[PDB]
Amino acid sequence: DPMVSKGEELFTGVVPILVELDGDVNGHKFSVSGEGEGDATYGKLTLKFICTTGKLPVPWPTLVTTLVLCFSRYPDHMKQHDFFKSAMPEGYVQERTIFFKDDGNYKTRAEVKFEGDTLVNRIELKGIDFKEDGNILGHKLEYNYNSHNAYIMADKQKNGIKSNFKIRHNIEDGSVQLADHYQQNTPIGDGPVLLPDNHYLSTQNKLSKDPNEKRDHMVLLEFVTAAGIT
């Protein structure tokens, strides 16, 4: 399939990744820069993110989903359903609203595309209605992540995909802060894309620290794999 080959060609080996985010949460402005690489053959991502403006005013785990689904591993039998690679190299827009239960919300707009050989994710994030000593602005979330599955559906009105899914962040008292995600992706170019049958993505994230790094930062190892529906 020449369309599948096009995506293969772009993602069959290790691809460098750059991530740049500008954020404002309740008027707390911040920027994050990330660098690393992805190997879609294994659904595998490894990046280091740095808050370049000082202290990050929200917990790092709450930014993981915002901070490149083209690196997901679509099994061979599902390659006709990989919208994310099919939109490349021109890329796609990824938009979300993330509702933190009993707290504020993030709204994000990102463009994911190739700049030469490098896959780039440029993000604007706006957060409002947060409680200034709630779990987010009060930094009450553990530095870890629970694995999760998210259903993906075609969004025919936008020539793309949509997804709503739940993330549960662990609170330092043992409870859980729900983050209900609503997501839409639409292609940037005019070319054809692969619109998928319903399926899901299964994700495992490992968060760590660089022992020699004094800036506020996050090291991330992520695996995302497509599956279903059966």
Swiss-Prot record:
Gene3D superfamilies to which the protein is assigned, alphabetical: Green fluorescent protein
Keywords for the protein's UniProt record, in alphabetical order: Chromophore, Luminescence, Photoprotein
Q: Per the record, what is the consequence of mutating residue 176 to A?
A: In mut2.1; shifts fluorescence lifetime from 3.03 to 2.50 ns
Consequence of substituting residue 193 to A: In mut1.5; shifts fluorescence lifetime from 3.03 to 2.72 ns
What's the reported outcome of changing residue 203 to H/W/F?
A: Results in significantly red-shifted excitation and emission maxima
Summed up, the tissue specificity of this protein is: Photocytes.
Phenotypic consequence of residue 198 to I:
In mut2.1; shifts fluorescence lifetime from 3.03 to 2.50 ns
Task: Specify the effect of residue 155 to V.
Answer: In EBFP2.0; shifts the excitation and emission spectra to shorter wavelengths and increases quantum yields compared to BFP
What is the recorded phenotype of mutating residue 175 to G? In GFPA; leads to enhanced fluorescence at 37 degrees Celsius. In Venus; leads to yellow fluorescence, improved maturation and reduced environmental sensitivity
Effect after changing residue 222 to G: Suppresses the 399 nm excitation peak, leaving only the longer wavelength peak at 475 nm
Q: Any recorded use in biotech or industry, and what is it?
A: Green fluorescent protein has been engineered to produce a vast number of variously colored mutants, fusion proteins, and biosensors. Further generation of mutants led to more stable proteins (at 37 degrees Celsius for example) with brighter fluorescence and longer fluorescence lifetimes.
Q: Look up what happens after changing residue 80 to R.
A: In Azurite; shifts the excitation and emission spectra to shorter wavelengths and increases quantum yields compared to BFP
Processing and modification events after translation: Contains a chromophore consisting of modified amino acid residues. Maturation of the chromophore requires nothing other than molecular oxygen.
Q: Which Pfam families match?
A: GFP
Q: By its UniProt entry, which SUPFAM superfamilies does this protein fall under?
A: GFP-like (SSF54511)
Biological process (GO) annotations held by this record are: bioluminescence; generation of precursor metabolites and energy
Give, from the UniProt record, the effect of changing residue 148 to D.
In Cerulean; leads to improved quantum yield, a higher extinction coefficient and is 2.5-fold brighter than ECFP
| Effect on the protein of changing residue 203 to I | Suppresses the 475 nm excitation peak, leaving only the shorter wavelength peak at 399 nm. In H9; increases fluorescence at 395 nm excitation
Subunit text: Monomer.
UniProt family annotation? Belongs to the GFP family.
Sum up the protein's function in the record's words. Answer: Energy-transfer acceptor. Its role is to transduce the blue chemiluminescence of the protein aequorin into green fluorescent light by energy transfer. Fluoresces in vivo upon receiving energy from the Ca(2+)-activated photoprotein aequorin.
Tell me what this protein is called.
Green fluorescent protein
Origin organism of this chain?
Answer: Aequorea victoria (Water jellyfish)
What gene name is listed for this protein? GFP
